[PDB]
């Protein structure tokens, strides 16, 4: 198990434009296109991302390319943030994957609300951090996925993805 396999499980793979859990146009392995309700706007973002006129359908290779870019971007986003970097750096490789997962799902400023959780994670107060992470819109809206990610933070194992 690794970050790619983990996010592949949590996000799935769809080669046609679909709406994500929040109702937003998405493609591939959870590649958010736009928050606009316009399918045409979404198709435009897709074409821009792929570099060709797609009309809402991509290949597996194209999906995986976007996925690689997105995972890369998530990690880079963490390290660029002078406040988030220390927490990330304090973690083992398994928990780092859990951090990337959350960033991927909500954006580093979607994680702005997780300040208190982050503090407990840096303190390695795993059970306390786990309890705190669940007190969130995130957990309530996507409980199955949140439970998996939280278990990964609690244990530092891949048990939730077995
Ligand atoms: F740097 C970090 C992040 F940006 C983050 F979102 C989470 I959840 C983390 F646990 C973390 F360490
Ligand atoms: Cl599930």
PDB file of C-alpha atoms and ligand atoms in Angstrom, residues 78 83-91 95 98-100 102-103 106-108 111 114 118 121 133 153, ligand 1:
ATOM      1  CA  UNK A  78       1.914  21.008   2.244  1.00  0.00           C
ATOM      2  CA  UNK A  83       2.840  26.093   9.330  1.00  0.00           C
ATOM      3  CA  UNK A  84       1.753  22.752   7.799  1.00  0.00           C
ATOM      4  CA  UNK A  85       5.261  21.618   6.864  1.00  0.00           C
ATOM      5  CA  UNK A  86       6.378  21.050  10.502  1.00  0.00           C
ATOM      6  CA  UNK A  87       3.378  18.807  11.233  1.00  0.00           C
ATOM      7  CA  UNK A  88       3.943  16.800   8.056  1.00  0.00           C
ATOM      8  CA  UNK A  89       7.692  16.523   8.747  1.00  0.00           C
ATOM      9  CA  UNK A  90       6.941  15.213  12.251  1.00  0.00           C
ATOM     10  CA  UNK A  91       4.998  12.232  10.865  1.00  0.00           C
ATOM     11  CA  UNK A  95       0.624   8.998   8.501  1.00  0.00           C
ATOM     12  CA  UNK A  98      -3.068  10.133   5.499  1.00  0.00           C
ATOM     13  CA  UNK A  99      -2.151  13.849   5.482  1.00  0.00           C
ATOM     14  CA  UNK A 100      -1.851  13.871   1.675  1.00  0.00           C
ATOM     15  CA  UNK A 102      -6.973  14.899   3.380  1.00  0.00           C
ATOM     16  CA  UNK A 103      -5.231  17.657   1.375  1.00  0.00           C
ATOM     17  CA  UNK A 106     -10.355  19.311   0.575  1.00  0.00           C
ATOM     18  CA  UNK A 107      -7.339  21.519  -0.287  1.00  0.00           C
ATOM     19  CA  UNK A 108      -4.741  22.865   2.186  1.00  0.00           C
ATOM     20  CA  UNK A 111      -7.615  21.827   6.160  1.00  0.00           C
ATOM     21  CA  UNK A 114      -8.111  21.333  11.314  1.00  0.00           C
ATOM     22  CA  UNK A 118      -2.851  19.030  13.529  1.00  0.00           C
ATOM     23  CA  UNK A 121      -0.942  14.902  15.504  1.00  0.00           C
ATOM     24  CA  UNK A 133     -10.592  14.730  13.518  1.00  0.00           C
ATOM     25  CA  UNK A 153      -3.646   8.445  11.713  1.00  0.00           C
TER      26      UNK A 153
HETATM   27  F1  LIG B   1       0.909  18.986   7.010  1.00  0.00           F
HETATM   28  C1  LIG B   1      -0.279  18.386   7.175  1.00  0.00           C
HETATM   29  C2  LIG B   1      -1.439  18.823   6.366  1.00  0.00           C
HETATM   30  F2  LIG B   1      -1.335  19.804   5.457  1.00  0.00           F
HETATM   31  C3  LIG B   1      -2.729  18.138   6.589  1.00  0.00           C
HETATM   32  F3  LIG B   1      -3.814  18.495   5.883  1.00  0.00           F
HETATM   33  C4  LIG B   1      -2.801  17.123   7.527  1.00  0.00           C
HETATM   34  I1  LIG B   1      -4.650  16.186   7.795  1.00  0.00           I
HETATM   35  C5  LIG B   1      -1.685  16.746   8.272  1.00  0.00           C
HETATM   36  F4  LIG B   1      -1.791  15.758   9.181  1.00  0.00           F
HETATM   37  C6  LIG B   1      -0.447  17.364   8.098  1.00  0.00           C
HETATM   38  F5  LIG B   1       0.601  16.957   8.837  1.00  0.00           F
END
